Design a protein around this ligand. Structure first.
Ligand code: 2S9
Length: 468
């Protein structure tokens, strides 16, 4: 409206007052996305962007928040004339969705750094005329709610955002950009991307948010970073509390990434009486298995990251193998470059550093070392197998000789007597390879001294050696 009942908790004088507001909105028919995003952006501004004069919490006065809200609703109502776009069935049309998208887009500053922090919220849109990529999609959904368009909802993959709308909520529309230097498909469906089996569209197993899940998104979007070295404890606490509220009300049930975020926040600062981070990462993975065909990568990455930081090398390797086991059933497409980077860093930086330390610890007499555990070698092999299988049938290759050097080094961290204990079984520790590259590498995986040149040839399917 704002409606009288939405105004009664103001002023918000603390983290807990903001939690109160979220609880009240989540108990309504429809939580007010515009109100909530403006409040988070206000408090994030004064806790992370400009802390000058801060003494405890930046009090959110109704007059201030109501005037920002009025700025937003005036901008959207003035620019989108609904009479031009009749709604039959009480559902929206593609032209209406595109118009709202255009209005948001056309309001943005002509030039700014798109991956800056703190440009995710409606506070940023109103006060700075700046939004990040997914922020634009969220703003479209907020604007649509403000206009009464109950059918328009946020859609989220692991690296992009768009909307769903229309009869049965079955239509899709691009509303925002993706990446850097990919050309807009604003207004179009996501069906080509789904059909090509790219990671970006998750084979169709992407989140279709309800209003509560859109609240969860804006909560995950909070950015406690003050600078590279420093997070706002106040924003960490607020995000954590808001995620527990959502969790308790059931609104994280279908939101794997949110459960990973909450697990990471609990690792940093555990809440007494709550599930441990590991339980939460596993809930994230179970959510992806239950609702999204186990076609998400980040539930496993989140888990691997935790094990890595805790130097549980076996369990980290297991979880990265599981990431690869998901990616293997995708085609590597243009605009998947974020997940390629993730896999590259794991294979070529993280795993090497971990195994380097494990090697030094083994020299110092360690027992139960991953490097002496054939099931850990099997995980390493399953990780490469999934990456090789991913590559098969993709329009663009994945592996190159730069990966080969690290593979050879990583393999060699395990002694031959350990590697010999993995049984590689064919269809039709034990491991089955899905990729042709690893099936052909079987021959070389158990020699005392790894034949480096042969491994390079097999991984990159470079077929010739130097002439002279
Ligand atoms: N090992 C390991 C490891 C590697 C990577 C990793 O990533 C964890 C964080 C994943 N990241 C995925 C993208 C995501 C995010 O950019 C995102 C999510 C979905 C769609 C979208 F367009 C953007 C933010 C979610 C709230 C505001 C945008 C933010 C979180 C965690 C562990």
């Amino acid at each position: 409206g704002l409606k009288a009942a939405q105004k009664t908790l103001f002023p918000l004088r603390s983290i807990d007052d903001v939690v109160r507001l979220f609880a009240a909105e989540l108990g309504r028919e429809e939580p007010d996305l515009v109100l909530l995003s403006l409040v988070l952006g206000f408090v994030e501004h004064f806790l992370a962007v400009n802390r000058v004069g801060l003494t405890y919490f930046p009090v959110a006065d109704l007059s201030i928040i109501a005037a920002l809200y009025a700025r937003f609703t005036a901008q959207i109502r003035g620019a989108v004339d609904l009479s031009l776009y009749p709604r039959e069935g009480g559902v929206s049309s593609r032209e209406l969705v595109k118009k709202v998208s255009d209005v948001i887009w056309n309001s943005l500053s002509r030039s700014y750094f798109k991956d800056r922090a703190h440009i995710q919220s409606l506070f940023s849109f109103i006060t700075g005329t700046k939004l990040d990529s997914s922020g634009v999609a969220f703003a479209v959904v907020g604007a649509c709610q403000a206009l009464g368009l109950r059918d328009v909802h946020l859609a989220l993959s692991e690296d992009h955002a768009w909307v769903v709308f229309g009869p049965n909520g079955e239509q899709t529309a691009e509303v925002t950009w993706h990446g850097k230097g990919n050309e807009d498909r604003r207004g179009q469906t996501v069906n080509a991307g789904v059909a090509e089996r790219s990671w970006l569209y998750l084979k169709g197993s992407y989140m279709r948010c309800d209003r509560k899940m859109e609240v969860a998104f804006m909560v995950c979007a909070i950015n406690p970073s003050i600078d590279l070295h420093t997070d706002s404890l106040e924003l960490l606490q607020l995000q954590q509390k808001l995620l527990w509220l959502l969790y308790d009300l059931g609104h994280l049930e279908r939101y794997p990434m949110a459960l990973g975020n909450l697990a990471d926040l609990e690792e940093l600062e555990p809440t007494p009486g709550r599930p441990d981070p590991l339980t939460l990462y596993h809930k994230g993975i179970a959510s992806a298995k239950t609702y999204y065909r186990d076609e998400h990568i980040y539930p496993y990455m989140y888990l691997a990251g935790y094990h890595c930081r805790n130097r549980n090398v076996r369990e980290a390797l297991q979880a990265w193998a599981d990431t690869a086991t998901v990616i293997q059933d995708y085609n590597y497409c243009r605009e998947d470059e974020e997940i390629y980077k993730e896999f590259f860093e794991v294979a070529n930086d993280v795993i090497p550093n971990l195994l380097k330390e494990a090697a030094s610890l083994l020299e110092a007499g360690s027992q139960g070392s991953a490097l002496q555990d054939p099931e850990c070698f099997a995980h390493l092999l399953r990780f490469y197998d999934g990456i090789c299988k991913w590559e098969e049938g993709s329009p663009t290759p994945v592996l190159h000789v730069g990966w080969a050097t690290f593979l050879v080094q990583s393999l060699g961290r395990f002694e031959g007597q350990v590697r010999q204990k993995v049984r590689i079984v064919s269809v039709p520790p034990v491991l089955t390879f899905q990729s042709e590259k690893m099936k052909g590498m079987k021959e070389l995986l158990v020699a005392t001294k790894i034949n480096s040149s042969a491994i390079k040839l097999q991984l990159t399917a470079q077929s010739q050696v130097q002439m002279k």
